[PDB]
Every structure is written in C-alpha cells, then in structure tokens.
Amino acid sequence: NLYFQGVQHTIARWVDRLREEYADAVAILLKGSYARGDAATWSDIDFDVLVSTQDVEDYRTWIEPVGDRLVHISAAVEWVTGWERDTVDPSSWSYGLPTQETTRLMWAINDETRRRLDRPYKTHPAAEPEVEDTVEALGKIRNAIARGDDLGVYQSAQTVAKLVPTLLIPINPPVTVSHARQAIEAILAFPRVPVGFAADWLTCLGLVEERSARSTAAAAERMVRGVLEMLPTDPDLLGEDIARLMNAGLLEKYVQQ
Amino acid sequence: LYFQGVQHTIARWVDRLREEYADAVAILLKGSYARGDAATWSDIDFDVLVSTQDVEDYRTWIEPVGDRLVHISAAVEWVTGWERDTVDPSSWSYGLPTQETTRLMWAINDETRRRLDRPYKTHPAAEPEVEDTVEALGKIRNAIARGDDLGVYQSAQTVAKLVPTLLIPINPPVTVSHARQAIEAILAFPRVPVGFAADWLTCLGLVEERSARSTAAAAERMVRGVLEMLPTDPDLLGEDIARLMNAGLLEKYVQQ
Numbered sequence A: 001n002l003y004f005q006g007v008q009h010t011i012a013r014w015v016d017r018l019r020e021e022y023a024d025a026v027a028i029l030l031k032g033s034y035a036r037g038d039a040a041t042w043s044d045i046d047f048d049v050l051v052s053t054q055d056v057e058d059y060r061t062w063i064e065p066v067g068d069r070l071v072h073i074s075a076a077v078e079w080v081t082g083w084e085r086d087t088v089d090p091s092s093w094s095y096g097l098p099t100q101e102t103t104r105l106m107w108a109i110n111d112e113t114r115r116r117l118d119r120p121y122k123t124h125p126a127a128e129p130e131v132e133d134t135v136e137a138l139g140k141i142r143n144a145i146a147r148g149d150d151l152g153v154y155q156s157a158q159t160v161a162k163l164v165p166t167l168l169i170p171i172n173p174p175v176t177v178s179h180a181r182q183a184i185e186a187i188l189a190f191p192r193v194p195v196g197f198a199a200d201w202l203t204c205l206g207l208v209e210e211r212s213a214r215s216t217a218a219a220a221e222r223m224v225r226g227v228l229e230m231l232p233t234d235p236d237l238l239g240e241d242i243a244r245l246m247n248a249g250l251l252e253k254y255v256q257q
Numbered sequence B: 001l002y003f004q005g006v007q008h009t010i011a012r013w014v015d016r017l018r019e020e021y022a023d024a025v026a027i028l029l030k031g032s033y034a035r036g037d038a039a040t041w042s043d044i045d046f047d048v049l050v051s052t053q054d055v056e057d058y059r060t061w062i063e064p065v066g067d068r069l070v071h072i073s074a075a076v077e078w079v080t081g082w083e084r085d086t087v088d089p090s091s092w093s094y095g096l097p098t099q100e101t102t103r104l105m106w107a108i109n110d111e112t113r114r115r116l117d118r119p120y121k122t123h124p125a126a127e128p129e130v131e132d133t134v135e136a137l138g139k140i141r142n143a144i145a146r147g148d149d150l151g152v153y154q155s156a157q158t159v160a161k162l163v164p165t166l167l168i169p170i171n172p173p174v175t176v177s178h179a180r181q182a183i184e185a186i187l188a189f190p191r192v193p194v195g196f197a198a199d200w201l202t203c204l205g206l207v208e209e210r211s212a213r214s215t216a217a218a219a220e221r222m223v224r225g226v227l228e229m230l231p232t233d234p235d236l237l238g239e240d241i242a243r244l245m246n247a248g249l250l251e252k253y254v255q256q
C-alpha cells in the first residue's frame, strides 16, 4: 500500500510533464480507477489531455517504474471542443445505460476553462430502445436452433442480452454508472424486470459457468416475451411503426406464430 | 413454398417503397435474402437511399406471406452519407474487414444505377488495440484477486473482442459478410497462438462450461501468446506501443 502513494506521486508528476509536452493544452483531467479512488494492483493511470488544436485525436502510453513495480500510464489527447461535445453521445461500454464518466480536473490554462471543466464527471445519455433488433436477434436464435448451430445460438443470445437493457431503462428508476463492471451491477439490480431476469440475462450474455443451446434459447424466449409485455406503447420512445405494431397485436402475433 | 411468396413480396415492396418515398434514388436488398441464405425467421432487409440530406430513419412492417407473417424493415438514409460509410469498420465483425452484401433493386437513373449496382459495400479492418487488450487482462487480474467471477467473465470478453484486431495483420486477409461468419473466419485463422481456437470461445463466453479460473488462464495464455507474434511496427501498432515492446518494457509490465 506504499505502492499507492508512489502512484499518487506519479500522477502529480505526470500532470506537469503533460503540460510541458503539449503547448496547445488547455486542460488535464484524471480519469478511470484513480479518479474514482477504487484502483487496484493492475489499474492503469488514465489521463485526458484536452488541446486547442482542432481534430486532434491521439493516444499515448507509458510504462514507468514505481518502486519495485511498473505502472501503465495512458493519455488520450483530444480537441477540447470535440471532447465536450461527445457528452451527447451514449457510451459504448454501458449496455446502453446513461453514464457518469468520472473526471478530476488536474490543471486548466485559465479561470474560465477551469470553471467550465471542473466537474465530477462528463455525462452521456441512455442509448435508445431497440425493439426491432431485439426481435431479430431472437429470430436468429430460432434459426440457429433449427439448424443445430449451438455457437450461433450463443452468439445471437448475446445480441439479445446486449439490447434488452435499452428496453428496460425507460421503465426503471433513473440510474447512471461510471464504468463497465458497474453497468452489470445496475442492470442486475433493476427493480422492474420480467420473471427470471438475473439468471437469464447472464446466461444470454454468456457470463455463466454452465449453459446449453436449449437453456440459452429458453432464457431469451422468456426475456423477450416478458419484456415486450412490460413496455409502454409510446411511438416517440419506441418508434412509430413499432408502437403501432404492438398496439395492433401484430408484433405479438409475429413472435408467437 | 413460403420462400417463393417471399420473393414475390420483395418485388412488391420495392414498388411500394418507391411510391412512398418520392425523394428516393435507390432501393437495395440487404442481409439474408440478398445472400440467398435466409431461413424461417429471417427478415426482409431494405436500404432506401434518399436525396434528402441528413435523413436517418428506420421503418418496420409485419406482413402476411400466405399462412405466415414476415418481418420487413427499411433503413432510410441520405444517399451520400450511406456512400461515405465505407471508411469505418463494421461494429459486428470483431474488427474484421467486411463486405456488406448489397443487391440493388431499383435506381432512379442510369448514372445512379451504375454508381450503386455493386455486389457489396466494404468496410476496413479495425486497427490493432494492444493497449486495451493489456488493460483488460489487468482488469481480469484485479477481478480474480477480489473473487469477482462476473468481472473476470466480463473483462475476458473484452480481451476476446480485441484479440482479432491483433491477429489480422499476421494472418492472410479475410472479409466476412455477416456476424456469424465473423466467428467462423476468426476460428479459421491459420497463424494463432497455442490454444487459440478453444480459448477464444471460452473468453468470449460462447461455451458450455468454464470457470473464472479456467477463463483467466485462457486469457493469460492468449495475451502472452499473441503479443510475441506481433511485429513491433510503429505504423501498425502506434509509436509508443511499438517502442515499448521493442524495449521489452510491455512484456516486463505484463509479467511482473
């Protein structure tokens, strides 16, 4: 645990080093595990270096000694305006959940940049519901079952499990997450889910010790049917054609035929 | 006999789409029916390219074909944005270059016909992600140490999703047209580390049985196996990464 003090010193030391290196820098922020305070042995030191130069996107890596160990350091160098702007795009690592991308401002070039970038996180909105593609992936599962392709079953079930949260988010209390592992935690904790959710979702994701093509296909059939019957038929939320088809009973008829 | 009525349904839908979209310049058949490998639950997949800029919309019908219902979908998009899309890697291919099958059904003029009547649309391979593969191994290691099985499984999936970006440059070039074929092509890579085919499925979590312990062991084998097979080229892997590997420092970090 004296490793951790050497890392904190490495972080402080790197901030000044990054400044010296990037004349176009306007702000330097700590990200990831060390910004959250939950780092462990193999955690990386993660920096964003925001610059004034437009269209810049580069990725730096260092391996540096801390006592008798080496630590991995990384920096994403990015145009400041591009970095601020991506707050309107959903994260790709949260299964569609809205996110709080943890930031700790280390340095900023002036007062106004300081005031603007001194926030505990950068937000991202939820990914939109994908009813149609969830239903298609169930179709792929059924096709793979019919032809005896277990691997195809497992693959398509992952697609169903990756998409289902986009359906469950709107009918659950608002929750955000700050990192990938926590996304699994928030989803598993959703108060409003169909019967069997926890085990079914992990089976379909493939994050279990034991399953079969039969049990996996079964989990997906339960989940899709259970979730669709819980969804409000709102055209702005789900899409006009989708809500219409659900209200007409056509989507149900299709799935159950 | 069901698939024959589908063919007639397809032809009928093109006329329909033309009539509904005045701003249309082309309609293309995509997916299973464009490949000719469709089955019972396959969907009829259309791209409807419009002259109207910045348009992105997604349509859905459910239609009778004899004694069954068929799912029909249309992606409506600015013709020019559709065309520009070739510069980005597909999201569904584990980083493999792709040939998105395209069968042009209708085009507004002879020039549009010629610009668009192509057998597929291409996307390039995703670039190698050495750093993120190593980080995900780091996460697996932290997860094991705290007894978090789910964390091990999750971060092993990350390792497995990135490893193909590493194997592509040391293997004969291959492209795929759909997601299921991506798995087949990757399992068929001839130049891979010891244990690759079995381990990759284990880490992806596409197997009947594994444990946190066996999964971590697979990812350790894999990552160490793949890195020693990579050329230390700055253009391929990135400047820092190549330097660090050539210096021995990345290996030292991973094995410490």
Ligand SMILES: NC[C@H]1O[C@H](O[C@H]2[C@H](O)[C@@H](O[C@H]3O[C@H](CO)[C@@H](O)[C@H](N)[C@H]3O)[C@H](N)C[C@@H]2N)[C@H](N)C[C@@H]1O
Binding pocket: A032, A046, A059, A074, A076, B127, B129, B131, B132, B135
């Ligand atoms: N995966 C987790 C890591 O993601 C990012 O870094 C990673 C970048 O996202 C990676 O960039 C990749 O993802 C970005 C964003 O999609 C793409 O623009 C880029 N072309 C693509 O290569 C880049 N090649 C490596 C860098 N470590 C974070 N900055 C740090 C985080 O720990």
Ligand SMILES: NC[C@H]1O[C@H](O[C@H]2[C@H](O)[C@@H](O[C@H]3O[C@H](CO)[C@@H](O)[C@H](N)[C@H]3O)[C@H](N)C[C@@H]2N)[C@H](N)C[C@@H]1O
Binding pocket: A128, A130, A132, A133, A136, B031, B045, B058, B073, B075
């Ligand atoms: N996943 C396979 C399907 O992918 C696409 O469609 C799907 C679109 O890709 C989906 O759009 C999603 O993906 C696109 C592209 O990333 C995003 O721009 C969009 N915001 C996001 O919602 C849209 N919401 C549903 C539509 N069926 C293909 N056009 C059809 C294919 O069967």
Ligand SMILES: [Cl-]
Binding pocket: A032, A033, A179
């Ligand atoms: Cl992290």
Ligand SMILES: [Cl-]
Binding pocket: A098, A125, A126
């Ligand atoms: Cl939101």
Ligand SMILES: [Cl-]
Binding pocket: A133, A136, A137, A140, A159
């Ligand atoms: Cl799908």
Ligand SMILES: [Cl-]
Binding pocket: A158, A162, A205, A206, B157
């Ligand atoms: Cl998955």
Ligand SMILES: [Cl-]
Binding pocket: A159, A162, A163
């Ligand atoms: Cl998906």
Ligand SMILES: [Cl-]
Binding pocket: A179, A180, A181, A182, B139
């Ligand atoms: Cl994580």
Ligand SMILES: [Cl-]
Binding pocket: A181, A182, A185
């Ligand atoms: Cl967590």
Ligand SMILES: [Cl-]
Binding pocket: A244, A245, A248, A250
């Ligand atoms: Cl209807």
Ligand SMILES: [Cl-]
Binding pocket: A228, A229, A246, A251, A252
């Ligand atoms: Cl329904």
Ligand SMILES: [Cl-]
Binding pocket: B031, B032, B178
């Ligand atoms: Cl397909």
Ligand SMILES: [Cl-]
Binding pocket: B003, B032, B033, B035, B036, B037, B038
């Ligand atoms: Cl066919």
Ligand SMILES: [Cl-]
Binding pocket: B118, B119, B120
């Ligand atoms: Cl071509």
Ligand SMILES: [Cl-]
Binding pocket: A158, B157, B158, B161, B204
């Ligand atoms: Cl995965």
Ligand SMILES: [Cl-]
Binding pocket: B158, B161, B162
């Ligand atoms: Cl990934």
